[model samples]
Target chain A: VHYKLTYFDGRGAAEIIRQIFVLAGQEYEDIRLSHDEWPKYKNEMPFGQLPVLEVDGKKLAQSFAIARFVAKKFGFAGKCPFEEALVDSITDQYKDFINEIRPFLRVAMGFAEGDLEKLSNEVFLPAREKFFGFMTNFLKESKSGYLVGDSLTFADLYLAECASEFAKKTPTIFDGFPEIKAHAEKVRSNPALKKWIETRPETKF
Target chain B: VHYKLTYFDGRGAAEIIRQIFVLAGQEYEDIRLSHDEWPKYKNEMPFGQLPVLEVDGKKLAQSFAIARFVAKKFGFAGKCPFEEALVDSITDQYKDFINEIRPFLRVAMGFAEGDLEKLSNEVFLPAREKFFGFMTNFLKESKSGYLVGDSLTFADLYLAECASEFAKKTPTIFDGFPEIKAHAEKVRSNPALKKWIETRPETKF
Candidate 1:
């Protein structure tokens, strides 16, 4: 009868899931836990990971899995098998880009130990630069605002939300990629997302 | 009109992709490249990555993407949205685990400069141990040999193939993971996968 999402008090991994539910016009309890609070619920979660979606009382882990479920229900998974793969492929590309920056976040998040800022600029920046390069090529080659077939899909939402999250953390993040910046804006500006953007509780990484 | 898989001459990332094709009884051009030859084709490939799928003259990147696409058409993605999500969730779990061991492979693949063996013992082993623990919990709880529903999905192929690859390298990885060992064996024994397992081209990482 309902859905429940649990994650850290940020859009780190669960943003797309929340966005999908919003797009689908579905309601769910959004549980955002603090670092201290996560320990209490840690053992109950699968793989000791955040961003688990409890659907029909079944706890599903893995952000991609959660997002794709919502996206599929909302018609964002693509219209056919091949298109679905293309969408999944694009989503994976974005997922890979996000995972590339994971080490810096892990250091900051206490899962790993290192100089967070140092790694953010050194490892994270270079990885992001490469991602942006590919994304730039994708945009130019396709000549489309969206990553997939001439419409908005979960893939666009993912890229847009992820870019926004990164942009918020580092104001100068989109210095060179104006088109990417505009694309994210286009996605966030969608009617489905604007309400959540306007009313959702603010959180940080 | 045709399926062409391009990757290194190994089962590294493209193993599951190839196996899925085998499982579906679909024929594809298995294009493998040596390390020396990879650089030559690197720039032309999207995002400078491998395991690119060229279908109908359009190149799609990401192994998970391509695998899920094939699995979808072949019925390995599960029968419904929820089931598909379960399939994807399991795949993401496996993907995350593989990423957990990335540092050692990075050093081996020349992506990063580090002590491969030392990192393998220090970082990779413990990480894999933790992954194995969670996975064991999964199989016991599901009471189903497959990662998702009662039927085999892309996730099973991914895990079995990944475990096989790792086992081939370490040779004792499944020493304590009898359930995982048996689960992987079950996947390998599938009517669709057995033929490829028997006759596929042998390559290295």
Candidate 2:
């Protein structure tokens, strides 16, 4: 299948799809755009958003939806329907966490004006644990190292992608959640993903 | 399979699942809790949230995830894998619209302190058209009355559920978007859904 995934040249939302492509050993065009270049292509996008996946000829929007689509195609979604639902459930919960932190992230990214420290302390610090704690519990109780079932699903990749960045910013974010750290490590240590991570574009997110 | 769906005693998030159950001709325990009775059962929930689905003995969280799971099980998700992804894309985009208007909705619902009129003008009015316009475009461009495909996927039900509510709050919300209104009418007029709506407990939201 001819696949072209377009998004900003960052690991923000599109990285999980990229990681899925790598894990699947599938070849696809990875189109990255700078903020300056996005406006020209804005109206062309299905939802005027980045991370649109053009499969064959039709374009699909929404990052998690695209990620789930690609993951399902590549056999990383789940082994069964119920398992897939679990994967979706975990990912949607993660989406909630991301939405909750958007205010703090907007300030940190300089897109808005706010007390970054205050947000980090009052919002980010407390909120991250509350969200991540559930994932940690999921990992601890899970039969495998992955988030759902016994095998690696896109939900695992989803968390690992953000956990890597979260670790970089906080350093001790996963200190108490060793299971969560180990889960991220397990996803990253995959041979295909490791190579991609070593060579992929670096950006601050 | 024995099924039990739990949520607030309102047609908020869980109604789609309820409608889907009714559409599927499946018998399920529809457990609605009052706001006062929620805290007693809150901690037992997987994420301390409403709209958990207990299938057989296993519990699943997240409203859309549960809805999609039941839809997939009942053959309303999509005709095929790609169609399912399309359904997901539409629903996730709809979710973005919901998240975008949460602030305005909070004020309107008296859950937060703000100028409701100001938020309505600045946020809800303009944002609703922008978001609903995309759905209108999707419906206009679609080969059938439904959003994603010709069939009645859960995405259609999701939009129809919210559109019904939005149309009530603002009579002119769908004045220009006849396709969207027609789509909602098509979903609402489904025999099983009409029966459920007529018999379902009434709530302000």
- Using DockQ as the measure, which candidate wins? 2
Best candidate, lDDT: 2
Model 2 root-mean-square deviation: 1.3
- The residue-by-residue lDDT of candidate 2 on B61-137, one tens digit each, is 99888999999899999998778888898889889988889899998787999988788778887887887888887
True contacts kept of each: 0.90, 0.73
Candidate 2: docking tier: high
What would you estimate as the lDDT of candidate 2?
0.87
Estimate the Cα RMSD of every predicted model relative to the unseen true structure.
2.9, 1.3
Candidate 1, position A203, lDDT: 61
DockQ list for all candidates: 0.74, 0.82
